[model samples]
Target: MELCSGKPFDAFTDLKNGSLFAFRGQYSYELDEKAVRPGYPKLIRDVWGIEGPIDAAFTRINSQGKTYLFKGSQYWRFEDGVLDPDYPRNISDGFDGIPDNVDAALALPERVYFFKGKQYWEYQFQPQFISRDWHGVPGQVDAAMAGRISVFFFSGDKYYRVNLRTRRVDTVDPPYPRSIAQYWLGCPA
Candidate 1:
C-alpha cells in the first residue's frame, strides 16, 4: 500500500469483527478484513527525529483497549480505527503558553518522557501534568498516571522526581549518561 506523509490521527482493531484500520491526516484506510480496530488505544505514529522527514507514525495498543495517535506534540484517540470525536484536543499550548515550534513538537517519547523543546517531563500512569509547575509547556501529556509519582527532565541536564501527592520536585542523575539521546518507557502512561 502507498503510505503518505503527515501524522496519523487514530487507529484500531475490531477483534470481535476481525479487521484493522488507520486514520492519517484527513484520510482513513482498512488494514484487514472482518476484524475492526479502534484508534483510541494504539500508538499510531512516532515523528521523533532531528531532520523530521524520515520518521513514520506507527500503531500500538493501549491499556484501555483503545488506539492513540502520537506525533511530536499532537496525540489523538481513535474508535474503531476512526478519529474519535474527543481527539486531537490541545494538550499543551506550548512554551509558556506560546505555540511550540514544529521540530520540538514532533519528537517522540523517550522512556515515558514527554519532551517539549530541550525539557522533558515524566508521568507514572496515575499523576497528571501540572501546568502551573511547568510554566504551561505542553506536549504529549498523559493522564494514565493520575495518582502515581511523576518525573521531569529539564534542558540543563537536570532531572527531577515529582511527588504527585506532595507536588514536590527533587533533582537527581538520570539512569544513563547525559550523552544518551533517547530512553524508552516500556508502556505509555
Candidate 2:
C-alpha cells in the first residue's frame, strides 16, 4: 500500500478470489471474508482493471440470487477472468430526481446504498428508492469509501458510520483516516 496526497497512492497485492480490500490513506488488512461472493473474474484486475477507471466498487446481491460487480458507474458480471457484457442499465433509472455523480457504494442484505457527491441514499434491490437518506450526516467523503450492513461515509475530515437497524449515524473517529479508494465491510469466505 502507498500513500500520496493524503490518500492511498495505489494498491498492489495478491487478493484471494473472493476477498474484499478496503483502503483509507492506508490499506486495512482486516479481511471481511463473509462479504465476498461467487462470480467470474476471480481476480481484482478483471473487475477494477477494466478499460476505464474505477471510482467505486461493491457487490450487489439482487433478489434473483445474482451478484453483480458495481464498478465506477457501470455494472458488470464476472465470468472466468472475463467481464461479461450482460449488464443492466436501468438499475438506477427509477431514481429519476436523484443526481448521477456516484462517488461510493455499499450493499446490504435488503438494499443498496449509493453515495452520490455529498448525499447518501438507499435504494431497494428491486429498483426503487427507500426513504433512508443520510444527507444530514456530516463529512466530505472521498472516492474510496465502501460499506455493508451499514453505510459509511466521510464528512468534515472524519469517517462516520450509519447503523441500518436504527437509521442512526455516528462517527468513527481517528484510527480510521482518510481514504483514496473505496473501503469494504463484510466479505465472503
Candidate 3:
C-alpha cells in the first residue's frame, strides 16, 4: 500500500456493501482492508477508467438505489463495481457551484459532503436539506468521515471532529489522526 509519500486526500465507503475507495495522485488503491483489519490491497485504475490521477472522489447512493462516483468536474454512475456506458459526464450538468479538483469528500447520514481546500459544501437531495451555501467548519480538511459518530476532518498534522450529538467541531490531534494513516489507509488522492 505504498503511495507517493503523499497523504490520502479523498475517500468514500458504500454503506450497503462495506466497500471503500481511496485516491492519490496518478494512483488509486483500494484499502482491501486496513492494517488493523488485515485486508489485501487492490489497484483501482488497473480495473476501471479513471482518466488520470484524481484530485478527489467519493461514493454516493441515491434513494432509488443508484451509485454515483464524483470527482473534479466529472461524475460517473456505477453499478456492480462497473461504471455505466454513459459515464464521465460534466460536473455542472448535475451539481452546480462544485468546481473541479475537489480536495476531499464523504457521505453522511443526511447529506454528501464535498470539499475544496479551505471550504466545503453539503449535499442532501431534499429541501431544508438543500443549502449550497458555503459554511466554515474547521481547518483545511483533506478528508472527512461519518462513521465516528461525529464529523471528522483531516488537515496536515491536524485532526478535527464535530460531535454528532451536540454542536461542536473540536480540533485536536486524536489517536486516529496520528499518522498519514489517519486520513486514508493508503492511496494518495
Q: Against the true structure, whose lDDT is highest?
A: 3
lDDT of each: 0.32, 0.42, 0.55
When summed lDDT is taken over every stretch of 10 residues in candidate 1, the lowest stretch is: 47-56
Ten-residue region with minimum lDDT total, candidate 2? 5-14
Cα RMSD (angstroms) for every candidate in the order listed: 12.4, 8.0, 5.5
Candidate 3 lDDT, tens digit per residue, 28-68? 55444434643334455664566545554555555544455
lDDT string, candidate 2, 1-189, tens digits:
322223331221112234444433223232435634322122344333444333344554443333343434355544433555655343355344434446555566465566554455666632222223553354335432334455555433345556767656644433343332333221232
lDDT of 1: 0.32
Give TM per candidate. Answer: 0.27, 0.51, 0.67
Descending-TM-score candidate ranking: 3, 2, 1
Model 2 quality (TM-score): 0.51
lDDT of 3 at 52: 43
Q: How far is candidate 3 from the true structure (C-alpha RMSD, Å)?
A: 5.5
Model 3 CA deviation exceeding 4 Å by range: 1-6, 14-16, 32-41, 61-67, 126-137, 170-177, 182-189
